[PDB]
Symmetry: T
Subunit: 67 residues, 12 copies
């Protein structure tokens, strides 16, 4: 039947988790078609003078392949 | 001693992670008593024209059983 | 063929590990029939003035579903 | 929407798909809005002729009424 | 020495597990050369009116990279 | 009380998953006694010109050991 | 070369996940130097009349050791 | 240097966890040499009319192999 | 509130509970506000009479002073 | 910034580091802004003289162009 | 079809990781046949006055079993 | 009986894996007594102009606690 592919991306944001996820999805849309779902694999980040410097959300993005 | 039960629910929200968690907990309260804690097992979601379509947070909800 | 169900319970006891497991199984028997096996998922607990206060054993209890 | 996941173990002497079908058929007896499943484990018992009973442990997700 | 690459695909089929796996490998062959092995990561699916609707097998496909 | 042992085998077959599992169990039967249960640890395989070449199912086979 | 140490902390907040993470990082800065990165290990929490009572984020905080 | 081997056994006992572990170690001693350490992999069991029927502790037993 | 988790390995020739008690007793010597523990691993050494030393690896959580 | 992670398996008859270097060298052929790697698995093949080929499965992270 | 078996061994060496892996494979060769692949499960070791004393690599060794 | 403690360190080195492990153990010895064993949790690193820049080995170091 249909076949999907999953790519692993890492979105980042200085503001929050949702923002980091949205950033990765927005970049994905630039070159990928038929984006369907995502799975968060890891949540990490860097530390700076303001506490969190960058939130880094590692996720798998699943999209349908064309035939 | 006391015995607790853990049920697995999936809360969803178009707005964010916390909202999805709160949605699952609110639904849990409708039929379950003595809700005590929760554990997030997975964070995933669907993708749409606005990026994230639905955030889906899979969690275990622990509550005390009556004797 | 036959179908079984697994429920997740957390047995607790101030006596010890075995007692915590037994507490969960005793409560399970109150509303579940055809209890067959259990699987320990986690062993944890609270700390008191002189050591372990309450042992908490998270387990899955498997039982056969009726007709 | 809020979904719930229950854990069932389907069994069958025939094969993996049959074991999964057995669990879903029983789920349907009392659960509405069945949507997806996830296989957690595949195991089974052994007899003189090899596999006696195939056992598929799965999580079944369904939408809760609101 | 040689270097291989692994891509993550989700093969789907309404026929069964093997068919889902075969669907993923058939699509992989369309754009990937020197396909060598696969590893199943997850088996899941959707539910229909009378049982499994679509089987979905998440797998990693390993292939040798060219010069 | 009783003690069981678990051996890890990889059954293979060009036919399918069930056939691969059965191949491992058939082999275990040649030199082991009291085979009771199995647990699938991994499912993988090789690829050929027609898709799956060989299905490979990694499993643990549990059997009862004879009493002292 | 350089050597880092990782400590496990649990930040809490009644308001959200990011707030809980920031709380742990702020406490870490009180006694630790050279804070560099963090990794979320678990997200859980307590339940109250308002739904979530306390969000609890378990994280590893990595920092460089001095020589 | 030295090489060790690990075997997987499931000790059982109606008495408790420690007893189940001891049962597996006692059995390992019958045919193995240089038993050094063990690691509990899983704790499970069967259920009877009075709660736990049989405790089952799955463990890996590590032992030293004789030098070449 | 902010908590910290440390990893200790309690040991005892007696049993699992005794091993856990040993780790908690040592934790109490230098750590305040001990609240909970989580068993990470259960292992041990072997002697001529079976278990020599039971070893319980656990994480101990305690509240940090503010 | 947004990064991407690809999974490669480097191999070498020499050792672990050489296997890792092999994967990174191939990655560099088509991927820009290579930043970090994570070893997922270490395995290999066996021959008459022991290890034939060391195989290191790793994830390679790189920054995507914006 | 064909069936393989996997044994778990811990190779050790004061020299390094590769040497530890090689030690386990050399030992496996003494009593096993058709050794085909290995998988590292864990890397650990002991500590001495000069840092690492003994490297210990836990691995699974897969080999083909003879046909029925 | 005896009680041991495990600390998590990340040894780094531009020389190789063993060197990274040795760096962590050398630093550990500076403030920890009765060092006994170590367990590798992760192997990772940074990438430079011609390959691995810095190897980073995350490990747990176990040592015996004193009276
Ligand atoms: C392994 C697996 C895991 C899954 N996990 C989840 C989960 O966690 N939650 C969940 O709710 N569902 C999940 N799904 C279901 C998934 O999100 C889809 O609903 C399902 O796979 C059906 O997809 P499709 O065939 O319609 O693909 P689609 O890609 O939806 O099919 C064509 C559609 O693509 C749209 N499209 C075209 N260009 C683009 C573009 N550039 N970007 C985006 N869309 C575009 C078109 O408008 C068209 O309607 C999962 C599926 C699989 C296989
Ligand atoms: C395996 C396990 C994991 C845990 N993990 C955590 C954790 O991550 N974080 C943490 O802080 N604690 C955790 N706990 C502790 C837990 O949250 C409780 O504080 C503890 O178990 C004591 O619960 P209880 O017996 O007071 O139950 P309770 O259910 O609190 O006992 C009775 C109480 O129920 C209340 N109640 C009645 N009806 C309802 C209702 N409909 N909804 C809600 N409450 C109602 C009553 O007002 C009454 O005070 C965990 C406990 C276990 C066993
Ligand atoms: C995924 C899976 C994992 C398993 N893991 C293990 C394991 O770790 N260890 C192990 O040893 N086995 C394990 N088993 C086997 C299991 O424990 C059973 O032996 C097996 O599933 C067969 O169960 P059954 O059909 O006989 O069920 P049963 O529940 O034994 O069938 C009905 C029985 O229930 C009794 N019963 C029900 N309610 C009552 C009551 N109120 N009062 C008195 N009697 C009552 C009846 O008298 C009757 O004999 C596992 C099975 C599966 C499917
Ligand atoms: C955590 C999570 C993981 C997911 N994983 C996957 C995945 O792996 N693959 C994938 O493809 N999708 C996956 N999904 C998506 C899922 O399959 C659904 O498509 C999605 O959740 C939307 O469901 P719904 O609200 O339409 O529910 P539905 O349950 O579809 O809504 C009501 C439907 O129930 C039917 N119904 C109720 N009772 C009966 C009955 N007795 N007999 C027949 N029909 C009946 C009605 O006819 C009606 O159409 C996932 C979703 C979540 C939240
Ligand atoms: C990390 C890892 C894990 C592995 N896991 C397994 C496992 O689970 N099971 C197992 O059995 N093996 C496994 N292997 C082994 C693997 O399957 C290969 O046998 C091994 O890597 C050697 O591959 P190769 O260099 O011969 O590649 P190949 O891809 O076999 O080399 C080139 C071949 O590709 C053919 N080819 C390419 N494109 C086409 C085309 N379009 N039409 C026709 N022919 C074409 C050529 O004719 C040529 O013979 C694994 C290997 C690694 C590195
Ligand atoms: C850790 C653990 C996990 C388990 N998981 C499961 C599970 O997933 N599912 C489940 O249903 N049960 C499971 N069990 C239960 C198991 O399958 C047994 O039913 C139970 O342990 C009782 O075994 P026994 O003492 O009767 O052993 P045995 O005496 O070995 O039982 C009789 C068995 O011996 C075999 N046998 C007899 N003679 C021979 C011979 N000459 N050659 C080869 N075989 C022979 C028979 O075919 C039969 O299966 C589990 C048990 C344990 C301890
Ligand atoms: C195992 C591992 C995992 C990693 N994971 C990630 C990741 O997920 N994401 C990522 O982006 N990077 C990650 N890194 C990289 C990490 O964040 C650093 O960028 C890198 O390790 C270099 O650190 P450093 O030597 O400069 O240390 P630094 O501590 O940055 O070196 C000295 C610096 O400390 C500053 N400093 C002094 N006092 C304090 C204080 N009290 N609090 C804070 N800073 C102070 C000084 O101003 C000075 O510039 C990881 C590194 C390792 C080893
Ligand atoms: C991967 C790994 C993990 C480890 N994990 C742990 C751990 O969790 N905890 C820990 O404390 N140590 C652990 N160890 C250390 C281990 O227990 C040994 O102390 C160490 O490996 C040194 O062993 P050895 O070379 O002295 O072996 P051996 O020569 O096997 O040591 C002497 C042992 O032989 C036994 N023995 C002698 N004759 C016989 C006989 N005739 N029949 C049966 N047994 C006999 C003795 O009872 C004694 O235990 C681990 C080692 C490795 C490699
Ligand atoms: C990530 C996480 C996981 C959790 N998991 C669980 C779980 O599995 N089970 C569960 O039941 N709960 C669990 N909890 C809840 C936990 O046990 C506490 O109930 C909760 O964190 C609230 O702690 P507190 O702020 O009251 O701290 P406390 O430390 O209880 O506050 C101060 C207390 O310290 C005592 N104290 C300080 N020094 C000493 C001393 N030397 N001797 C004696 N007493 C002393 C004081 O008497 C005082 O009562 C968890 C919490 C978190 C954050
Ligand atoms: C999820 C995650 C995990 C991480 N884990 C770790 C970790 O384990 N350890 C750690 O230390 N850090 C880790 N990091 C941090 C990482 O290594 C980077 O330091 C960080 O992501 C910042 O990268 P950058 O934006 O500067 O990208 P860069 O790619 O460094 O930015 C552009 C650079 O690319 C170079 N470049 C491009 N093409 C070529 C070419 N062909 N040849 C040579 N140079 C070229 C340019 O010269 C330029 O300097 C992690 C980061 C994330 C997001
Ligand atoms: C679950 C699984 C995982 C795998 N993972 C990998 C992987 O990670 N990487 C990879 O490259 N391949 C992997 N393989 C492939 C594997 O290494 C084999 O290439 C493949 O299974 C084919 O084996 P065979 O049937 O030729 O066996 P065999 O007949 O065993 O193959 C010949 C082998 O026998 C050995 N041999 C012959 N005579 C002797 C003797 N007298 N003493 C000792 N040894 C002798 C040779 O040295 C040679 O290696 C995997 C296979 C499976 C089933
Ligand atoms: C959970 C667990 C896991 C284990 N895993 C392994 C494993 O993977 N491999 C393995 O082989 N073993 C393993 N072990 C065994 C471990 O390495 C020890 O051999 C065992 O715990 C016994 O330790 P001990 O009590 O002798 O401690 P020790 O620390 O050996 O006791 C005190 C010793 O420290 C020395 N010392 C302290 N500071 C200094 C100093 N500054 N200068 C000189 N000497 C100093 C003293 O001279 C004295 O001999 C494990 C043990 C446990 C509990
Ligand atoms: K958030
Ligand atoms: K099948
Ligand atoms: K006990
Ligand atoms: K090395």
């Amino acid at each position: 039947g249909k076949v999907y592919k999953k790519v692993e991306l890492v979105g980042t944001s200085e503001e929050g988790l949702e923002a980091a996820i949205q950033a990765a999805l927005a970049r994905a849309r630039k070159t990928l078609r038929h984006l369907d779902w995502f799975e968060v694999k890891e949540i990490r980040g860097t530390i700076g003078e303001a506490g969190v410097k960058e939130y880094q959300v590692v996720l798998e993005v699943g999209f349908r392949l064309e035939e």
